[PDB]
Nucleic acid binder design. Sequence first.
RNA 1: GGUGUCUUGGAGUGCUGAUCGGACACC
Length: 17
Amino acid sequence: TRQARRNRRRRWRERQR
RNA sequence: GGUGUCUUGGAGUGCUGAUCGGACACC
Protein backbone atom coordinates (compact mmCIF):
# COMPACT_ATOMS: atom_id res chain seq x y z
CA THR A 1 0.00 0.00 0.00
CA ARG A 2 2.32 2.78 1.40
CA GLN A 3 5.25 2.24 -1.01
CA ALA A 4 6.34 5.79 -2.20
CA ARG A 5 5.45 7.45 1.21
CA ARG A 6 7.99 5.30 3.20
CA ASN A 7 10.71 4.74 0.47
CA ARG A 8 12.85 7.88 -0.10
CA ARG A 9 15.23 8.90 -2.96
CA ARG A 10 18.67 10.50 -1.96
CA ARG A 11 19.17 12.87 1.04
CA TRP A 12 22.19 12.84 3.41
CA ARG A 13 21.78 13.75 7.13
CA GLU A 14 24.92 15.90 7.76
CA ARG A 15 24.80 14.81 11.50
CA GLN A 16 22.06 17.38 12.41
CA ARG A 17 21.28 16.32 15.98
C1' G B 1 -6.61 11.36 8.69
C1' G B 2 -7.05 7.59 4.34
C1' U B 3 -5.93 6.34 -1.13
C1' G B 4 -2.47 7.63 -5.49
C1' U B 5 1.89 10.87 -6.32
C1' C B 6 5.88 13.98 -4.51
C1' U B 7 8.45 15.68 -0.46
C1' U B 8 14.55 18.02 2.54
C1' G B 9 18.35 19.70 4.16
C1' G B 10 10.62 18.02 6.89
C1' A B 11 11.96 14.71 10.86
C1' G B 12 14.92 10.39 11.36
C1' U B 13 21.88 5.78 13.43
C1' G B 14 20.81 4.47 8.57
C1' C B 15 26.94 2.36 8.44
C1' U B 16 22.50 7.65 5.54
C1' G B 17 17.51 5.13 4.09
C1' A B 18 14.12 2.31 6.24
C1' U B 19 9.99 3.74 9.16
C1' C B 20 7.04 7.86 10.38
C1' G B 21 4.70 12.96 9.48
C1' G B 22 2.78 16.94 6.06
C1' A B 23 1.51 19.19 1.08
C1' C B 24 -0.94 18.63 -3.73
C1' A B 25 -5.24 16.25 -6.66
C1' C B 26 -9.33 12.97 -5.17
C1' C B 27 -12.35 11.15 -0.92
